[PDB]
Design a protein around this ligand. Structure first.
Ligand code: MG
Lengths: 252, 57, 234, 117
RNA sequence: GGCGCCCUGGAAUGGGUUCGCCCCGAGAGAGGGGCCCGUGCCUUGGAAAGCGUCGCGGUUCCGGCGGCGUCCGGUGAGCUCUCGCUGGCCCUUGAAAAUCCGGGGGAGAGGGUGUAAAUCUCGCGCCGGGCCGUACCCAUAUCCGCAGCAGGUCUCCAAG
RNA sequence: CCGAGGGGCUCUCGCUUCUGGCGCCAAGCGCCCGCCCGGCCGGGCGCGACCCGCUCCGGGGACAGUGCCAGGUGGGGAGU
């Protein structure tokens, strides 16, 4: 009768993110005349740390073409950039590390982070630490390129999706074990309220579909359909298979 | 001192007699002066070496 | 002469600040502006029925100038001159008791509810009709109705302009019922110059649909495909 | 005309001055808190007595809506004395007490004699 | 006390240094400077007031009256506080704004001289600073628990 | 393409990449008034900074959505 933990996360009273000490939205600069038709010069001033993000950020200042003013962006910092470095941005930008330029101009097999999934979106795909995307297969007519997402999914995008050359800094972060319960506490204290996760088997029938019984067992099959209502989608959701893996995935 | 006590002071205990007085550190002043000279001078050199390429091609 | 020097400003990408140019297209207008502009486009983009497309074919300005000259001296009574006329009839009625002093005061009628009764009774002799009536259905029957009752009509530009003839803001229709006899040859001179273009063409002006033209940014890329297709042959 | 900004901000129009053709309340109301309503009575306790000759301060009880400027003018005008400083207080019955110090040209122990006490 | 400030000058037979480190041809050691904190001392305040002691007046307001003293050093893993330097730890990186200052620019402004202007964040002098809170308990008896209830209830100072 | 002092079946764009500097509030040229008897001031406009146009620019797009109806599913929940 009682609603369950998975349903209470959507209202967001104690389940909102912890967004105070973060430094801002890490977005590529919004497109204008300069990045459509040439390049604009920018210098990176510092390399900073968001709480809850394992990628470092870089703050890059740009001479404004219209106002006598300088203005500061926040980039997903590609790996191997340093402070006091010139970052160039636009169509006629040269393919070096850390530069950001359209995917229709960089050649095939290049390694790309922080790419737009639609033109103007200012960077959405492959933003976490260690991640990158590869471009393959340009199509000059009906201008559209495909890329390889870090999940192995190939996806066709626009030709003019603006994207920064290289791989995200901070890679290898999941090679060190958390190794004790306290360092998982500090890991999620900066992100959300989700970490001490009670198994649904170990609770009462009001609180979960799997709870109850004089033994800790599930009782019902752990795989649920996808049109199952909110309050029943627990366990393996709409699974195509189960058990320990045979092959890598062998299914599109 | 604190920011609001700086309102009581006079601009002799608040800056230094150089250019970029109470802002810059006097060794990056020294480098900004050299950096502005040495690369505006090459924008004469790369200008005029470009200017002798149309006249002798 | 001695020291004054040229010092130009490079305005390419990555040089001096772009100067304050026009920018009158790329300006975020209020939503009463772009509602007002997007529907002027949207009468050019949808297929307009020929009943609305009776209009946009108005009189050319040499004909509207002769027509407003003819309609000028038939100007109606206003309230300043309504005072002294009720003197001038009655001050002589106090002095001579005329059985009929005035045989015919002529005037041009105004008002769609007035002109409509004149046309179907065939009392009107020329029907100037406006251009930009806000609910277009207030007027749209009347070019179809002037044809059947044989009364000549003509579309003029601006419901504000013939509204100034009647000392008002808009008046949407005027009609000529009783013109002067000595000036009938100025009213009858322009009627065949009018009823050529409106009454006699009604078998054709009722077929002619309007609208249905694409924008210039999209009718260019249709032509850029066709210029490729003319190079695909030759 | 050219529009050097991408923004349409609404034009500065004219704003008239309110000059009505009848007053809404027909008469300025008189100040209820004038200089007799300021200062009710003087305080004549033992602690108020020995602050007169030892300190050149005479103590009153004032209406609670009076600031120390109104008290300074409503004692200078009623009792014809120069006022140095005033120290007010809300004493916990709910009435405001003022400690009005006089100029050294004056004395308090004789000004208190001509105001009754 | 601190300096990641400057000048001379150039270092291997490498040297200088810490409790630990660390530092040096991108300039060590050595020599001479410069800046910051100066909560310590002296001085002005300021001895006139405070305390200690001795003695005499004054019924009474008496912030009476007089004498003398308030002096030398030493030491510390001491305790508490503070300022400063230096490490370590983090899949943890440890607030915002109000306010205030400095710099870059150079639109302008100013008297025109054997005289003084614009300006002054310099030294003085002038006037003002309104409204509200302030007592006391802060608890094995002034709070909550029906009560002068072994309960509960946030802190600061701390000797041999 | 040919060829002759050149023509333009066909075309590209272009004016910032060794470096932790700087960049705005127009120079210049062209004109015009009040101002100097063919000389002196104080102002204004254009080109510099191309013309026209019907959506701010892109991405979708008669789909997705939304309104009503129908059929599945539905201990998520309701009543017994
Ligand atoms: Mg668990």
């Amino acid at each position: 009768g009682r609603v369950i933990r998975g349903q209470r996360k959507g209202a967001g009273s104690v389940f909102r993110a912890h967004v105070k000490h973060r430094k801002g939205a890490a977005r590529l600069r919004a497109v204008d005349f300069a990045e459509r038709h040439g390049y604009i010069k920018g210098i990176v001033k510092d390399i900073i740390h968001d709480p809850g993000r394992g990628a470092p950020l870089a703050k890059v200042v740009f001479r404004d073409p219209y106002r006598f003013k300088k203005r500061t962006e926040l980039f997903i910092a590609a790996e191997g950039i340093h402070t006091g470095q010139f970052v160039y941005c636009g169509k006629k930008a040269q393919l070096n590390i850390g530069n950001v330029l359209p995917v229709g101009t960089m050649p095939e097999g290049t390694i790309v982070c922080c790419l737009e999934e639609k033109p103007g979106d200012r960077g959405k795909l492959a933003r976490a630490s260690g991640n990158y995307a590869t471009v393959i297969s340009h199509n000059p007519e009906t201008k559209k390129t495909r890329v390889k997402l870090p999940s192995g999914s190939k996806k066709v995008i626009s030709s003019a999706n603006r994207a920064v050359v290289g791989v995200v800094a901070g890679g290898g972060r999941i090679d060190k074990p958390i190794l004790k319960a306290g360092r998982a506490y500090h890991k999620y204290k900066a992100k959300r309220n989700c970490w001490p996760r009670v198994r649904g088997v170990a609770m009462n029938p009001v609180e979960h579909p799997f709870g109850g019984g004089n033994h800790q067992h599930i009782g019902k099959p752990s795989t649920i359909r996808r049109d199952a209502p909110a309050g029943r989608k627990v366990g393996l959701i709409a699974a195509r298979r189960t058990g320990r893996l045979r092959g890598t995935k062998t299914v599109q | 001192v604190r920011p609001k006590v700086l309102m009581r002071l006079s601009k002799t205990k608040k800056h230094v007699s150089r250019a970029y007085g109470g802002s810059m550190c006097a060794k990056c002043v020294r480098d900004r002066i050299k950096r502005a000279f040495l690369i505006e001078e090459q924008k004469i050199v790369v200008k005029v070496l470009k200017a002798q390429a149309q006249s002798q091609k | 002469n001695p020291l004054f020097e040229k010092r130009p400003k490079n305005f390419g990408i990555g040089q001096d600040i772009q100067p304050k140019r026009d920018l009158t297209r790329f300006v975020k207008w209020p939503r009463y502006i772009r509602l007002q502009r997007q529907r002027a486009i949207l009468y050019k983009r949808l297929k307009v029925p020929p009943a609305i497309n009776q209009f946009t074919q108005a009189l050319d300005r040499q004909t509207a100038t002769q027509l407003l000259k003819l309609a000028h001296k038939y100007r109606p009574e206003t309230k300043q001159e309504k005072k002294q006329r009720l003197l001038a009839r009655a001050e002589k009625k106090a002095a001579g008791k005329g059985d009929v002093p005035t045989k015919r005061p002529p005037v041009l009628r105004a008002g769609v509810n007035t002109v409509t009764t004149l046309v179907e009774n065939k009392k009107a002799q020329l029907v100037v009709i406006a251009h930009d009536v806000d609910p277009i259905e207030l007027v749209v029957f009347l070019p179809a109705l002037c044809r059947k009752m044989g009364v000549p009509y003509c579309i003029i530009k601006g419901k504000a302009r013939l509204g100034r003839l009647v000392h008002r803001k808009t008046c949407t229709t005027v009609a000529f019922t009783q013109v002067n006899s000595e000036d009938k040859g100025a009213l009858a001179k322009l009627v065949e110059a009018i009823r050529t273009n409106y009454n006699d063409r009604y078998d054709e002006i009722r077929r002619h649909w309007g609208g249905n033209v694409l924008g210039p940014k999209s009718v260019a890329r249709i032509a850029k495909l066709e210029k490729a297709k003319a190079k695909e042959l030759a | 005309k050219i529009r050097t900004s991408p923004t349409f901000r609404r034009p500065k129009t004219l704003r008239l001055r309110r000059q009505p053709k009848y007053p809404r309340k027909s008469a300025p109301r008189r100040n209820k808190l004038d200089h007799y309503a300021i200062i009710k009575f003087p305080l004549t306790t033992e602690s108020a007595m020995k602050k007169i000759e030892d300190n050149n301060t005479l103590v009153f009880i004032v209406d609670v809506k009076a600031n120390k400027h109104q008290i300074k003018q409503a004692v200078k005008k009623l009792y014809d004395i120069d006022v140095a400083k005033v120290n007010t207080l809300i004493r916990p019955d709910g009435e405001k007490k003022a400690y009005v110090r006089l100029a050294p040209d004056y004395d308090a122990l004789d000004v208190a004699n001509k105001i009754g006490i």
